[PDB]
Amino acid sequence: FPVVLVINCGSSSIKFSVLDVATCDVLMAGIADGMNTENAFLSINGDKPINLAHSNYEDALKAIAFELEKRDLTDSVALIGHRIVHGGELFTQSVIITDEIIDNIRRVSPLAPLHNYANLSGIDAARHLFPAVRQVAVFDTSFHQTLAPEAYLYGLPWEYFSSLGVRRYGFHGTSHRYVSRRAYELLDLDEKDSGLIVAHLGNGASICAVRNGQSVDTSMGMTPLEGLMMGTRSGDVDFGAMAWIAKETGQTLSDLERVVNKESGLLGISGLSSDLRVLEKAWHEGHERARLAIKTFVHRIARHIAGHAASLHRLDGIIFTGGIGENSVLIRQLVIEHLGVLGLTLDVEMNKQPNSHGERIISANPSQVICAVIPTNEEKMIALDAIHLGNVKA
Amino acid sequence: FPVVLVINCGSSSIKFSVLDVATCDVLMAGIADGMNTENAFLSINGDKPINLAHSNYEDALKAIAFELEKRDLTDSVALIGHRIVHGGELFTQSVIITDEIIDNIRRVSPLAPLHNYANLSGIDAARHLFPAVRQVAVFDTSFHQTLAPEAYLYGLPWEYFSSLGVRRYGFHGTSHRYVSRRAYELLDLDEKDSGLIVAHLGNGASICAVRNGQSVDTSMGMTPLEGLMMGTRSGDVDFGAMAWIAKETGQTLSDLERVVNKESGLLGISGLSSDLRVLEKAWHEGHERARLAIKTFVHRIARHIAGHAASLHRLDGIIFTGGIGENSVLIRQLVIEHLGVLGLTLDVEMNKQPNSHGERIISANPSQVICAVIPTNEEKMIALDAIHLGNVKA
Numbered sequence: 036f037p038v039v040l041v042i043n044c045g046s047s048s049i050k051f052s053v054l055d056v057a058t059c060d061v062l063m064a065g066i067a068d069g070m071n072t073e074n075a076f077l078s079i080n081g082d083k084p085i086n087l088a089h090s091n092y093e094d095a096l097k098a099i100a101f102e103l104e105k106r107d108l109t110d111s112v113a114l115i116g117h118r119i120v121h122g123g124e125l126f127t128q129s130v131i132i133t134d135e136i137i138d139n140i141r142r143v144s145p146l147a148p149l150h151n152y153a154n155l156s157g158i159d160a161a162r163h164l165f166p167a168v169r170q171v172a173v174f175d176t177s178f179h180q181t182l183a184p185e186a187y188l189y190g191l192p193w194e195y196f197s198s199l200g201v202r203r204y205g206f207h208g209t210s211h212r213y214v215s216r217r218a219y220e221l222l223d224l225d226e227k228d229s230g231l232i233v234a235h236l237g238n239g240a241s242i243c244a245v246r247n248g249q250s251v252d253t254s255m256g257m258t259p260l261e262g263l264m265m266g267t268r269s270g271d272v273d274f275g276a277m278a279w280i281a282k283e284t285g286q287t288l289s290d291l292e293r294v295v296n297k298e299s300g301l302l303g304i305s306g307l308s309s310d311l312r313v314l315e316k317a318w319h320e321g322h323e324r325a326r327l328a329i330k331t332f333v334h335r336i337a338r339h340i341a342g343h344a345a346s347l348h349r350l351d352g353i354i355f356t357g358g359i360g361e362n363s364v365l366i367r368q369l370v371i372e373h374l375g376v377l378g379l380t381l382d383v384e385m386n387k388q389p390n391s392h393g394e395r396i397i398s399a400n401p402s403q404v405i406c407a408v409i410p411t412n413e414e415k416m417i418a419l420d421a422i423h424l425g426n427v428k429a
Numbered sequence: 430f431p432v433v434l435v436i437n438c439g440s441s442s443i444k445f446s447v448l449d450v451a452t453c454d455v456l457m458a459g460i461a462d463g464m465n466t467e468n469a470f471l472s473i474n475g476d477k478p479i480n481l482a483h484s485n486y487e488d489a490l491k492a493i494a495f496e497l498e499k500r501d502l503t504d505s506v507a508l509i510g511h512r513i514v515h516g517g518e519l520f521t522q523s524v525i526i527t528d529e530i531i532d533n534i535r536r537v538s539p540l541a542p543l544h545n546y547a548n549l550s551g552i553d554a555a556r557h558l559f560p561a562v563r564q565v566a567v568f569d570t571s572f573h574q575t576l577a578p579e580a581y582l583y584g585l586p587w588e589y590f591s592s593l594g595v596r597r598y599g600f601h602g603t604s605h606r607y608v609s610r611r612a613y614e615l616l617d618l619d620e621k622d623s624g625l626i627v628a629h630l631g632n633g634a635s636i637c638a639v640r641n642g643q644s645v646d647t648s649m650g651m652t653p654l655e656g657l658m659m660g661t662r663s664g665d666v667d668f669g670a671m672a673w674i675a676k677e678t679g680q681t682l683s684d685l686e687r688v689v690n691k692e693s694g695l696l697g698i699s700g701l702s703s704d705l706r707v708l709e710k711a712w713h714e715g716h717e718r719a720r721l722a723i724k725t726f727v728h729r730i731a732r733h734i735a736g737h738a739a740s741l742h743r744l745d746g747i748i749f750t751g752g753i754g755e756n757s758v759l760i761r762q763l764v765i766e767h768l769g770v771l772g773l774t775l776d777v778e779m780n781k782q783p784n785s786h787g788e789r790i791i792s793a794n795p796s797q798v799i800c801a802v803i804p805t806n807e808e809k810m811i812a813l814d815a816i817h818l819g820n821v822k823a
């Protein structure tokens with residue numbers, strides 16, 4: 036009964052899952068959190084929250100490894116999959132990790148210095164702990180490497196692209212890929228003759244247009260700040276406005292980078308929370324800024340969905356996914372009603388079904404475009420790539 | 430035979446036109462250029478280019494006034510219309526200029542400190558030169574003051590909106606308004622039950638969605654930098670990319686503001702020119718960056734057109750205007766072919782007609798949406814507002 040260990044290291048945490056190679060079912064999950072804070076801690080579901088204290092990434096993972104040793108899983112770990120944020124232009128698909136891959140991850144890392152160095156720390160820790168286990172790197176950008184230059188270039192001087200690698204990359208790739216593949220089955224579409232828009236709505240949010248199986252446009256940019264307005268992230272913002280705000284309040288670009296990442300979006304408009312459920316309850320109570328935050332979020336989603344459709348020869352389906360997309364009855368219906376121009380018709384009773392209903396069609400018969408909810412599973416997609424790669428002679 | 434004098438002051442120039450109140454035909458036009466440079470000059474069509482030297486805005490306009498005195502037009506000037514860039518939230522329609530209006534223009538001017546102070550200098554000069562002539566202010570933002578909060582808010586902290594007036598304003602308003610009114614006649618639409626997208630493509634470029642006669646979305650932002658990629662302007666750019674570029678090249682936000690306004694867009698990608706005709710000839714010769722600049726420009730136009738359609742209940746027409754929209758056979762066909770997802774069909778022979786053909790339908794019968802070219806005339810729209818206001822008791 037081989038398993039895959041899936042690791043996702045952030046700057047403050049290590050999330051992990053252990054998946055059965057048979058069913059790609061989760062057998063165990065957990066989080067080493069408060070990483071590189073005075074008090075780091077390991078929590079496994081479904082168990083009690085262990086404490087870790089002064090622990091580096093290798094320490095946390097050794098603790099995780101000892102939790103697996105405890106449960107007699109160590110010898111079943113046949114593959115390790117690592118989530119890497121940014122693969123630049125170098126990675127167009129998931130890979131077996133070797134010294135070359137590592138060097139190439141380092142070379143692109145200046146494009147996402149928060150995220151990527153934590154991801155590389157996870158790799159270094161895992162290679163130490165599991166040296167006779169094949170490990171794979173799955174990149175949140177790779178799916179989008181099929182964008183044409185007209186879709187990835189910014190209107191900046193060519194030198195920024197050609198010397199510095201400034202271009203749109205896009206993120207959520209692993210989700211957009213997994214969900215689009217699920218959609219061909221659910222909607223009974225020919226992958227090679229098809230047009231989808233995926234809306235990954237979570238605390239991070241992005242749109243991806245998938246044409247004949249390939250990403251051809253996406254809403255995030257060189258970084259995850261561009262595009263949709265999100266939980267604490269601004270999404271698209273007029274650079275002139277930002278320059279005007281700098282000159283007017285005396286803020287540096289660094290202050291502003293913090294504002295636009297951590298103090299903006301649903302949190303920034305509402306003055307209340309980044310959490311959609313708090314805002315829906317607040318609107319329901321009369322709170323006007325909550326309502327504005329939500330309408331604004333909706334309006335920007337619709338604007339991006341329709342704009343991404345421009346990269347399709349034909350629009351077959353629109354697919355909601357992510358924590359919001361999967362769970363928000365209200366956000367889906369408001370978006371879909373904002374897209375009446377595309378001939379969409381919602382089946383409201385199907386829209387009201389909770390997410391326990393999994394992969395499901397929420398558009399009514401007369402709809403010109405099929406609308407659906409497909410739960411995303413980045414761990415499973417990571418495992419699947421690892422299992423495919425486990426057949427390869429490296 | 431009364432006339433309207435129309436004034437447009439920029440930071441380096443004063444453009445003017447004299448229009449017949451009968452026909453709104455242009456009787457004379459000209460430009461005092463090189464303003465506040467060592468060598469300022471007055472050029473009238475169809476005459477020889479006079480020189481001005483060390484001339485302030487009042488000096489240039491006195492020269493213009495003396496040109497009218499020469500031609501016995503002085504006593505026919507019944508109205509003066511001024512083009513004002515930015516009206517903030519204060520101006521929702523054109524107004525008779527009074528001391529109050531002036532004070533309110535000053536109060537919004539910090540939102541566009543280049544443009545607005547030149548516009549106010551034109552007003553001060555004209556009021557001095559023409560004190561018993563009614564003068565009117567027409568604002569490039571006013572048409573867009575019908576945007577709902579969900580469409581104008583940025584995903585920034587509420588305080589930036591509520592204390593500083595940071596929101597989308599949009600520009601080209603006078604063009605979008607003029608062209609949309611022309612479209613109801615050309616397309617035989619009921620203004621009150623209608624959906625249009627106007628694409629104003631010039632050296633500055635923007636989209637506006639007009640729903641039942643009112644602007645409901647537009648592509649420029651707090652400033653004219655947001656939205657479409659343009660001649661020298663970036664259009665939408667990931668704030669994270671911009672912050673990354675600052676940290677990586679040591680540029681200040683001020684350096685970057687210059688880059689994104691003057692060194693970007695078609696000029697920045699092509700490395701050649703901001704001028705579409707130079708780039709079309711360059712592509713035709715084999716130049717790959719010219720082709721990329723143009724494809725990128727096209728792709729962003731299509732993306733914005735489709736995204737603006739989301740704010741319509743129904744899409745009746747798409748209207749091209751501006752120097753590019755009116756003259757570029759190629760750019761129109763590439764955009765329209767990028768919008769096949771909306772069911773558009775081009776009539777290529779009608780698309781090839783030059784702009785001498787004026788208001789004209791370029792879509793073929795089976796098209797789901799009517800496509801047209803409507804030449805813009807901001808001077809005429811300015812005159813018309815002035816003529817209406819000339820009936821008012823102030």
Ligand SMILES: Nc1ncnc2c1ncn2[C@@H]1O[C@H](COP(=O)(O)OP(=O)(O)NP(=O)(O)O)[C@@H](O)[C@H]1O
Nearest residue numbers: 236237238239240309310311312357358359362363
């Ligand atoms: N029942 C619900 N109704 C509305 N929103 C919900 C519900 N359940 C979860 N959410 C929201 O979903 C968001 C979190 O989604 P999330 O779990 O982040 O997907 P995610 O993709 O893992 N994040 P990211 O990976 O950066 O996209 C929060 O706003 C939650 O409030």
Ligand SMILES: Nc1ncnc2c1ncn2[C@@H]1O[C@H](COP(=O)(O)OP(=O)(O)NP(=O)(O)O)[C@@H](O)[C@H]1O
Nearest residue numbers: 630631632633634703704705706751752753756757
């Ligand atoms: N025959 C042509 N083919 C292609 N482009 C043309 C042609 N004629 C003019 N243009 C382009 O139109 C652009 C200038 O348009 P313009 O005269 O700026 O409209 P405009 O709106 O007055 N500018 P703005 O007011 O800021 O929008 C330049 O790129 C020109 O090269």
